Amino acid sequence: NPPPPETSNPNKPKRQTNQLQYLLRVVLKTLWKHQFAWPFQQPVDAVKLNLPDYYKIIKTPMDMGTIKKRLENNYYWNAQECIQDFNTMFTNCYIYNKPGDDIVLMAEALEKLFLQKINELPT
Ligand SMILES: Cc1cncc(-c2cnc(N[C@@H]3C[C@H]4CC[C@H](N4)[C@H]3CCC3CCC(F)(F)CC3)c3[nH]c(=O)c(C)cc23)c1
């Protein structure tokens, strides 16, 4: 396994915005507690789950645990950085797996919910 993505940098500028608060308090919260969330709550442990090629295929890993930490630590300046990380998580699943796979259908359901919440992103 690689080390997890960076989640904290004290030398980055910090700002609180309505969009970033919403992403943490509404979007991430809602996806976290979704019935199909558990495979996406932490980095893929390719050693433990016997997926030796996962990090040969996925060079930009992302998970909701990392996203939570990034939001909490004010790692993102722009809301789009956070939205991009969610999208990377979904696309990684689509990349590593095949169309119509069970995990892909779970990711598709989370993505659908994500887009419903993003629709209500504050201005
Ligand atoms: C509980 C959990 C935690 N962390 C990660 C995973 C996880 C497992 N397997 C993945 N892929 C595999 C690759 C091949 C082989 C079998 C099948 N095709 C596929 C299994 C999918 C199921 C595994 C058990 C389950 F309960 F989680 C439901 C899905 C994974 N692929 C991924 O892309 C991610 C993000 C996790 C993952 C699961």
Q: Where are the domains of the chain?
A: 17-121
Give the list of residues 6+ apart from residue 72 with CB closer than 8 angstroms, or none.
24
24-31: long-range contacts, CB 8 A cutoff, minimum separation 24 = 24/68, 24/71, 24/72, 26/117, 26/120, 27/86, 27/114, 27/117, 27/118, 28/64, 28/67, 28/68, 28/71, 30/113, 30/117, 31/64, 31/86, 31/110, 31/113, 31/114, 31/117
Ligand 1 site residues, Cβ closer than 6 angstroms: 38-40, 44, 49, 51, 93, 96-97, 102-103
Q: Which residue puts its alpha carbon closest to atom 26 of ligand 1? A: 39
Cα atoms in the Cβ-side hemisphere of radius 13 Å centred on 118: 14
Tokens 């004010």, located at residue: 74
Q: Which CATH architecture has domain 17-121?
A: Up-down Bundle (1.20)
Resolution (A): 1.7
Experimental technique of record = X-ray
Asked if 37 and 68 touch (Cβ cutoff 8 Å), the reply is no
Nearest atom of ligand 1 to the alpha carbon of 103 = 29
Q: Tell me the CA–centroid distance for residue 9 and ligand 1, in Å.
A: 31
Q: Tell me the CA–centroid distance for residue 39 and ligand 1, in Å.
A: 6
Token pair in block for residue 70: 């990034």
Angstrom distances, CA of residue 103 to CA of 3, 54, 82, 109: 23, 14, 22, 10
